[PDB]
Nucleic acid binder design. Structure first.
Ligand SMILES: [Mg+2]
Ligand SMILES: [Mg+2]
Lengths: 239, 239
DNA sequence: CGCTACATGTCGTCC
DNA sequence: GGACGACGTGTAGCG
């Protein structure tokens, strides 16, 4: 219980209980390979029949159950959940959330492996190429939109909704920008169109809105044009 | 190598290589506990400094790096990535993706554990309480909306966008339904408003929009009412 | 394929 | 905690 890893293949019940309870107490990552059934009831409800999966319980209460395919866990519980090991006909991992109230139950039919990983990580992800950096680029360099553009507000609450960037053009009109870091879609335009209408109701048909994205879908283009909105091609920047 | 699980702690390089290789060849699950750095370049770009993480490679190319917090992996590749282990100053897990071009590099500074899990699973998640089931309820029992409501289409592409349920009321108006399995937000009302307008272009004032959800956010109700759109409380059914 | 919209979305960020 | 919208979103499902 100093070693980063403690692992037992084909553990007995006592061994399982010992390692599971150590993981929670030491606040380390618990990892288990097991044949299991999963029961979930919560926001939604689901059953998963008997099969082999990887189970992870993070010290912050995150609970993940992974099949041999996809990116997503087949079942999970978010940070803050409370997990208890519980003995029955078979051992059962039980994770509870109260807000909203959700129960995840993992019945462990055969545990092939259980492990405790006392992980030491002080580092945080450093990410670039986001929408937030698109905004920064525009405020530092407003001409990537158009000559004379004057960015004024970032994330301005208008009446209903929140606008990515609000500014004025060389004609003095109010300008709404809707930024997308990737190819913009129908819902991008609906967002932009929604902000613009609300603002037009105040400042007149004067108000411009501009979709700022590396590209558009066919449908985005269509709706953008039918509503008299504009498109400025812009790539999300990378430090 | 007929055991369901193979585990090596503090492996040698050749031990590391052997198990990774075997994992990929056997369509097994690879799990690694390691101190590592992560370099990602793709749709966006990111850097993660030295820290302990759980690393998972699924047979379908899904690649997950997990820290001891949250529910999301800090770095990943989705199914379809091709992974390989390169011997550099340290071993490096690579994982290239095509369309779009993405590379994920995991530098293994110290591998505390490597494991091969030959997982056997034929079962698919059975979930209830979804939006699809709201839809099915509404076709089985249209009076949950209102009497004389006749549903016609589900997931119907109109010109721009795809409508959840489309039908008529007993007064001969066209009805758009927008469904949400959870509390409805501004996004939903924007969808609904958008569909109603497009439909009004063909059929004129004879279109009704209805938001169907268990409840609304403040802004949603604000926008709903402003636009003369309706609301019917409905909870997603659980079998 | 490209487009669209759901999701037990999750997560940040303001209030 | 509710509201609001981003995310390297993932993922289905249909043209
Ligand atoms: Mg926005
Ligand atoms: Mg919809």
């Amino acid at each position: 219980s100093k070693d980063k890893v403690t692992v037992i293949t084909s553990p007995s019940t006592e061994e399982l209980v010992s390692l599971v309870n150590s993981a929670l107490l030491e606040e380390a990552m618990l990892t288990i390979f097991a044949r299991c059934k999963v029961h979930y009831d919560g926001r939604a409800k689901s059953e998963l029949g008997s099969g082999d999966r990887v189970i992870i319980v993070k010290p912050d209460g995150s609970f993940l159950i992974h099949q041999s395919k996809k990116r997503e866990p087949v079942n999970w519980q978010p940070p803050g959940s409370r997990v208890r090991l519980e003995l029955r006909e078979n051992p059962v991992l039980v994770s509870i959330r109260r807000k909203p109230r959700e129960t995840l139950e993992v019945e462990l039919e055969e545990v092939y492996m259980v492990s405790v990983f006392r992980a030491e990580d002080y580092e945080e992800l450093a990410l670039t190429g986001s929408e937030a950096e698109m905004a920064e680029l525009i405020f530092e360099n407003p001409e990537v939109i158009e000559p004379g553009f004057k960015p004024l507000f970032r994330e301005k609450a208008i009446g209903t909704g929140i606008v990515a960037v609000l500014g004025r053009d060389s004609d003095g009109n109010i300008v709404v920008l809707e930024l997308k870091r990737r190819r913009a879609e129908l819902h991008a335009v609906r967002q932009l169109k929604s902000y613009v209408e609300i603002l037009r109701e105040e400042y007149g048909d004067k108000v411009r809105g501009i979709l700022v994205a590396p590209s558009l879908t066919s449908g985005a283009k269509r709706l953008l044009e039918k509503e008299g909105l504009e498109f400025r091609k812009l790539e999300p920047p990378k430090r």
